[PDB]
Design a protein around this motif. Sequence first.
Motif, PDB file in Angstrom:
ATOM      1  N   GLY A   1       0.884  -1.173   0.000  1.00  0.00           N
ATOM      2  CA  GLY A   1       0.000   0.000   0.000  1.00  0.00           C
ATOM      3  C   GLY A   1       0.919   1.220   0.000  1.00  0.00           C
ATOM      4  O   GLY A   1       0.506   2.377   0.026  1.00  0.00           O
ATOM      5  N   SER A   2       2.202   0.947  -0.008  1.00  0.00           N
ATOM      6  CA  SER A   2       3.278   1.925   0.105  1.00  0.00           C
ATOM      7  C   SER A   2       4.590   1.183   0.325  1.00  0.00           C
ATOM      8  O   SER A   2       5.693   1.757   0.181  1.00  0.00           O
ATOM      9  CB  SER A   2       3.127   2.835   1.252  1.00  0.00           C
ATOM     10  OG  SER A   2       3.024   4.139   0.870  1.00  0.00           O
ATOM     11  N   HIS A   3       4.570  -0.082   0.604  1.00  0.00           N
ATOM     12  CA  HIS A   3       5.824  -0.827   0.932  1.00  0.00           C
ATOM     13  C   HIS A   3       6.538  -1.449  -0.295  1.00  0.00           C
ATOM     14  O   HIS A   3       7.470  -2.237  -0.154  1.00  0.00           O
ATOM     15  CB  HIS A   3       5.540  -1.966   1.873  1.00  0.00           C
ATOM     16  CG  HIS A   3       4.610  -2.956   1.297  1.00  0.00           C
ATOM     17  ND1 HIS A   3       3.501  -2.573   0.588  1.00  0.00           N
ATOM     18  CD2 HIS A   3       4.574  -4.310   1.359  1.00  0.00           C
ATOM     19  CE1 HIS A   3       2.844  -3.645   0.179  1.00  0.00           C
ATOM     20  NE2 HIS A   3       3.455  -4.712   0.671  1.00  0.00           N
ATOM     21  N   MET A   4       6.020  -1.151  -1.464  1.00  0.00           N
ATOM     22  CA  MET A   4       6.602  -1.582  -2.731  1.00  0.00           C
ATOM     23  C   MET A   4       7.232  -0.383  -3.401  1.00  0.00           C
ATOM     24  O   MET A   4       6.544   0.543  -3.755  1.00  0.00           O
ATOM     25  CB  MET A   4       5.541  -2.136  -3.686  1.00  0.00           C
ATOM     26  CG  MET A   4       4.819  -3.390  -3.296  1.00  0.00           C
ATOM     27  SD  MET A   4       3.725  -3.821  -4.665  1.00  0.00           S
ATOM     28  CE  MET A   4       2.425  -2.605  -4.525  1.00  0.00           C
TER      29      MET A   4
HETATM   30 NI    NI Z   1       2.804  -0.840   0.488  1.00  0.00          NI
END
Ligand code: NI
Length: 61
Positions: A1-4
């Motif tokens: 959700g933001s960790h990629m």
């Molecule tokens: Ni993420």
Amino acid sequence: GSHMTFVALYDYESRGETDLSFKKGERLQIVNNTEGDWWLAHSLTTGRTGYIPSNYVAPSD
Ligand code: NI
């Protein structure tokens, strides 16, 4: 959700109100990478948010 984190393969100039401009080599946090042609993203360097074309980026390693 933001960790990629993905990296831009090419420069991109926004064309509308919702898409995010970025430069080649910029790192982008991807909110969802299952959505097809447009991925919602944000830059941790500029803070800006918007949709990016998924064919412009690859994983940032
Ligand atoms: Ni993420």
